[PDB]
From a paper:
In bacteria, DNA replication is initiated by the ubiquitous [name] protein, which assembles into an oligomeric complex at the chromosome origin (oriC) that engages both double-stranded DNA (dsDNA) and single-stranded DNA (ssDNA) to promote DNA duplex opening. [name] is a multifunctional enzyme composed of four distinct domains that act in concert during DNA replication initiation. Domain IV contains a helix-turn-helix dsDNA binding motif that specifically recognizes a 9 base pair [name]-box (consensus 5′-TTATCCACA-3′). Domain III also contains residues that contact the phosphodiester backbone of ssDNA, along with an unidentified ssDNA binding motif that specifically recognizes the trinucleotide [name]-trio (consensus 3′-GAT-5′).
Residue numbers in the entry:
A (entry chain E), B (entry chain D), C (entry chain C): 109 to 346, 351 to 446
The structure:
C-alpha cells in the first residue's frame, strides 16, 4: 500500500544506537495497543525512524490483515485537516482518522507553531487512546523541547515510552552497507566497504549515496571496485576539527606573523594587533577555556585577553575594512 | 512545449568532462525512478546541465507520451509557490507539482536563504519520492557547499547520485564547434575551428558567441572565413596567468627599478622600498610558497619578507597616496 | 508609444564606425528572435545606440502589429523593480517584463552595483531567451569591463553577437549634417557643412548643437548662412598633440634657461633641476618612449632617466607648491 517495501524489520540493521527503539517498535508490532500505546521516537535525520515504523506497519498488516494501519506525515495531516475544514469535509476527516487500528506519524515537530492542527491532533490522540488503539509518533526532538506545544500534548507524549536514535558506529555502518549491497546484488571488497564507512559518517542517507556513486563510477569506468576506485570516486564529497594551533597557523598564514612573535612581550601596535585579532578569533570560535587559551598564547592572564577582544569587538562594530578582513579570515580558515 | 528542441541527447557532445553526467542522465532517462531517483548534476557555467535535463525530458516524453514531465527553475518554483500562497491556491499548487511523473528542477542554489520555500520543496521531494517519481536537480555547487540549506534537504540531496561537469578539453571544444557549425548549415575551416577553440576556454555559451561573431563579420565583409579573418573578427572579444617574473617586470616598468637592485643586499630606504612593495604584491597575488618567492627575491629569509610586508600593511592601512599607487599597480599588472 | 519617430533606419547614416552595428541591427529587425537573439551593442556617447534600438523597434512594430516590443532603460528597470517589490506587486512586474516579444533594454552598465536588480534582470533574460524572445542590450563599454557583473549575466551578454560603434569620420559627419538639414528643410551651403564637420568632431550631439547654433544665429542676423557667419556663430563654442620640444621650451622659459643648453653636459643644479622637471612632465604626460626621450635629451641612459624620474617623484611627494607650479605649466600647455 502506502508503505515502502524496502522498509521492514528483517531489512533493518540492529546496532547500539538503535537497539532500544527497534526493540520497542517490535514489541509494539507484536502487541499493538497493549505494551506501549503511545510510542514516541526521536533522533537525528537519516537515522531510521521512518524505516522503523514502516516496519511496524508491515508487521501489523502481515500478522493481521483486518487491521487498518494508516501512516502519514504531520505535513499531510495538517494539509488534509485544513482542506477538510475549507471544503466542509470535517466529518469525513474525523471518520478516516479516529477509526484507524494503528496510526503512524512522521516529524510531529511540524505541528509546532500551528494551534488548531495541534488541537485536532490532541483530540485524535485522545479518541484513539480511549478506544485502546495504537499511536506511534516520530520526531527529531524529544517532546520536552518542542516549542509552541501545549502542556496537555506534552504530557500525552511522555505518557508512554520515549525512544531515541543516535548516529551509528563503524560496525553497524559496515553492516548497513553490506545489507544494501547484498539486497542490490553486487560484490564489493571489505577494504572498499571499510573505507567508505570510515570516510563518510554523518547520517546513513549519505552512506547509501556514497556507495551508489562509487559503484556507478566503477560501472562507467568499466572496472571492478577497489579501494583506489572508492578513493577517486569519493573525492568531491570528503568535518575539519579546528585546533588552537590550526587557527594560529591560519592567522600566521593570512597575516603571516612569525611563530614566536605572539609569545613575545612586545607592546608595540604592529606586533600587538595580530595577537589580539587572533585572540578574539580563538575566543569566539574555539571551545577551549580562557585560562587555557591564555596559557598556550604566551601564558598571558585572562585580563589581557578580555580587554583585547573587547576592544576588537568595539573596533569591528563601527569599522568595515577590518570587517571584510575578518570575514575573509573566517572564509579561508574553513 | 516547455522543452527546447535543440537541447537533446543527439546534439550533446560527450567528452571527458561530461561523460559521467551524460551516463547518469541517459541511464535515468532509460529507467526513470528506478536507477537513481534523486539525481543531482552540478558544475560551472555554460556547461550543459540545462541541455542534459532537457535531453532527459525529451527522451522520457518520446519513449512514454503519457508521462507527465515538468521542467522548471527553482526561481520559477519560488515565484509560483509564493503566488499560490498569496492568491489562496496552495492546494492547486500541490496538485500541480506533487503529482508529476518526472520533475526536472534547475539551479537549486536559488533556494539558499528562502526557508519556507525550502520547506515546501522538502515536502514536495518527500511526496515525489514516496510515490516513486523521478527527481532531477541541477545546481552550481555541491549540496554541502550551498549556504542556508537545512540538513534534511542536504541529506536528501546527497541520498542519490551526484555528478559534476568540468570545462571541455580542446578536442571537445573543436567537436562542439563543428556540431554547431553543421547545425547552422555552413562550412568553417578546421584552421578557424582550432583558432577559436584554442583562443577561448571559458564556456560553450561564449564558444558559440565567438563562432557567431566570426561568421557575422565574414558575412558583413563579404569574404570567406579564414584564420586571419577570425583574428580580425575577434579583436575585441578575446586568462593571462600572473607570475612572479612578470610582477617584477611590472613593478620595474612602473617604479622602474633595475632588475638586480631587488637582489642587492643594500639597506637604504630608496633601494629597499620597491623590494618590499613588490614582495607584498606577489604575496597577495601569487600561489607560490613564501620560501620559493623569498629565494627568488635574492635568496632572502622568510622573516625579512614577513616584517617588510607587514610594515607595508601598516603603511597602507593609514596612508592614501600609496593606496592609489598600489591600486594603479594592481590595475596595470593584470 | 515609447519609441521615437525621428529614430529610424532611414534617418541613420551608415559609415565605417556603424556599418557592422547597422547590419546586425537590421538582421535582428528583419528576423526577430531567430537570427541573433542576445544582441549586444556598445560604444561611446552620442553615437547612435538608442537610435538603432528605436529603429529596430519601429521596424518590428511596423511589420508585425501583433508584436509586443518594449523599449526601456536600465534606470527605469531598476526603478520599477524596486517600486514593485516595495508595493508587494512584483507579480505584475514579472508579467509585464517576461512576456515582451522584443526587449530593448538600454545603458545596461547602470545595473553595476545593484545585486538584486542584476538578479532580477538575470531571471528576466533567462525567461525571455528560453521562450525565443528577442533581446537587445546597449552599453557604453564591452560586457567584460562592466564592474560588479556576475559571470552568469556576463556570459548571457556574450552568448550571441556583440557589436561596437566607433566615432564617425569626415564624410559621414558631412552626410549626417546634410541629412539633418534636409529633414529640417533649409538650404545650407556645403562649405558651411564642411566647416562645421571639420571643427567639431566629438559625437552627433555637439555636431547637431553646432548646426542649431549656426541656424539660430543666422536667423537672428537675418543673413544667409555662409562660412564667415558660421565661424562667427561658432566662435564661442570652439585636442592638441603634446610635443617634447614644446614642453622643453615652456619649462626652459619658466626656469630661466635658454634652449641650446638642454642637451649640454653641464651638471649644475640650476640647469639639471629644470631639466629633470621637464623630463618628468614628458614622462607623466606624453606616450613617447624612454629611448626616444633620452635621444631628445642628448643620448642620456635609461638608468639615468629612471634615477631622475624617481628623484623628482620622491621630492614632489613631500611638497605641494612644486605641484602648483607643475599644474600651472600644464594649464599653460593646455
Ligand atoms: N539499521 C539501520 N538504522 C538506520 N537506518 C537504516 C538502517 N538500515 C537501513 N537504514 C536506512 O537508513 C535510511 C534513513 O532513512 P529514513 O527514512 O529512516 O530517515 P529518518 O531519519 O527516519 O527520516 P524521516 O522520518 O524524515 O523519513 C533509510 O533509507 C533506511 O533504508
Ligand atoms: N557537451 C555539449 N555539447 C554541445 N553543446 C553543449 C555542450 N555543453 C554545453 N553546450 C551548450 O552550452 C550552451 C549553454 O549551456 P547550458 O545552458 O546548457 O548549461 P549551463 O549553463 O550549465 O546550465 P544552467 O543554465 O541550467 O545552469 C547551450 O546552448 C548548450 O547547447
Ligand atoms: N549615423 C547616424 N546618422 C544619423 N544620426 C545619427 C547617427 N549616429 C547618431 N545619430 C544621432 O544621434 C542622436 C542621439 O544619439 P543616440 O541616442 O542614438 O546615441 P547614444 O548617446 O549612444 O545613446 P544612449 O541614449 O543609449 O546613451 C539621434 O538624434 C541621431 O540623429
Ligand atoms: Mg524518508
Ligand atoms: Mg543550471
Ligand atoms: Mg546608451
Amino acid at each position: 500500500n502506502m508503505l515502502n517495501p524496502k522498509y521492514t524489520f528483517d531489512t533493518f540493521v540492529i546496532g547500539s544506537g538503535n537497539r532500544f527503539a527497534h526493540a520497542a517498535s517490535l514489541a509494539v508490532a507484536e502487541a499493538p495497543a497493549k505494551a506501549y500505546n503511545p510510542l514516541f521516537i526521536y533522533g537525528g535525520v537519516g537515522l531510521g525512524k521512518t524505516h522503523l515504523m514502516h516496519a511496524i506497519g508491515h508487521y501489523v498488516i502481515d500478522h493481521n490483515p483486518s487491521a487498518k494501519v494508516v501512516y502519514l506525515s504531520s505535513e499531510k495531516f495538517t494539509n488534509e485537516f485544513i482542506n477538510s475544514i475549507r471544503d466542509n469535509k470535517a466529518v469525513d476527516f474525523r471518520n478516516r482518522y479516529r477509526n484507524v487500528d494503528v496510526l503512524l506519524i512522521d516529524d510531529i515537530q511540524f505541528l509546532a507553531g500551528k494551534e488548531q492542527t495541534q488541537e485536532e491532533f490532541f483530540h485524535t490522540f485522545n479518541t484513539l487512546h480511549e478506544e485502546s488503539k495504537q499511536i506511534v509518533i516520530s520526531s527529531d526532538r524529544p517532546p520536552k523541547e518542542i516549542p509552541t506545544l501545549e502542556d496537555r500534548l506534552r504530557s500525552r507524549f511522555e505518557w508512554g515510552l520515549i525512544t531515541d536514535i543516535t548516529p551509528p558506529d563503524l560496525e553497524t555502518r559496515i553492516a548497513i552497507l553490506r545489507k544494501k549491497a547484498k539486497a542490490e546484488g553486487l560484490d564489493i571488497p571489505n577494504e572498499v566497504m571499510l573505507y567508505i564507512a570510515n570516510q563518510i559518517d554523518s547520517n546513513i542517507r549519505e552512506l547509501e549515496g556514497a556507495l551508489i556513486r562509487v559503484v556507478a563510477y566503477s560501472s562507467l569506468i568499466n572496472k571492478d571496485i577497489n579501494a583506489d576506485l572508492a578513493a577517486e570516486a569519493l573525492k568531491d564529497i570528503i568535518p575539519k576539527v579546528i585546533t588552537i594551533k590550526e587557527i594560529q597557523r591560519v592567522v600566521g598564514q593570512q597575516f603571516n606573523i612569525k611563530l614566536e612573535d605572539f609569545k613575545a612581550k612586545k607592546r608595540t601596535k604592529s606586533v600587538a594587533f595580530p595577537r589580539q585579532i587572533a585572540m578574539y578569533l580563538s575566543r569566539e570560535m574555539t571551545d577551549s577555556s580562557l585560562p587555557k587559551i591564555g596559557e598556550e598564547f604566551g601564558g598571558r592572564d585572562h585580563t589581557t585577553v578580555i580587554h583585547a577582544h573587547e576592544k576588537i569587538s568595539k573596533l569591528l562594530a563601527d569599522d568595515e575594512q577590518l570587517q571584510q578582513h575578518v570575514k575573509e579570515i573566517k572564509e579561508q580558515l574553513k
